[PDB]
Amino acid sequence: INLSNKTDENTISFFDSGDPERMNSEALMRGCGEQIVNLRPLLRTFRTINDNWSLAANTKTPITDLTNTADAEGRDYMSYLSFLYRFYRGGRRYKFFNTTPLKQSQTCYVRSFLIPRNYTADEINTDGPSHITYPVINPVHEVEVPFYSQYRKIPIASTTDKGYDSSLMYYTNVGTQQIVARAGNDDFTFGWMIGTPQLQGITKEVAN
């Protein structure tokens, strides 16, 4: 025997099993019907970040007021996955499903504008491209925000600069309650892969 502490790279598998891809594809054909191989498709899907987002009439609201919490929560895929990465690029898509339980005026209309990220409504004009819907004939306001950036990538941290990428401003002539679902455009993605954070599970109250 020779005195040494080394590494021989010994590897072992425990069963004389068939090709894993064969078995996996059979199992998918028999019990899933589809195959998820990448996590960008999940950014292409729409998932809910709030079932009840109340607005005040005649008020230009930036959606940051909501996303700044919906990103730390981790309920949607754009948030859950962001905790694995440090960068992102590309645009975003938002859908607003009307849930208003009262008639406020003979004509309810919804309007969306652009706005630089982290700005206030008193810091930006209402010109530029816009989208308008009428919740009574179309209760779903679908809109897309491009990647209008001074930078090729955007970090998920705080910066010294402000207004370096575009966002959404939301306006309504009445008090509307909406289900908000977001997603990424066909060009959104994330950057570095980093470690995971800790996950929160069931909570209980106990009157010790």
Binding site: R22, M29, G33, N38, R40, P41, R44, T189
Partner: peptide, 24 residues
């Protein structure tokens, strides 16, 4: 005919490496 082949749409998408299964 729906075996494990390109006869199925999503399986053909995978084994043909289309750009949609990656999100593009």
């Amino acid at each position: 005919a729906k075996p494990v082949t390109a006869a199925v749409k999503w399986f053909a998408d995978i084994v043909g490496g289309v750009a949609a299964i990656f999100g593009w």
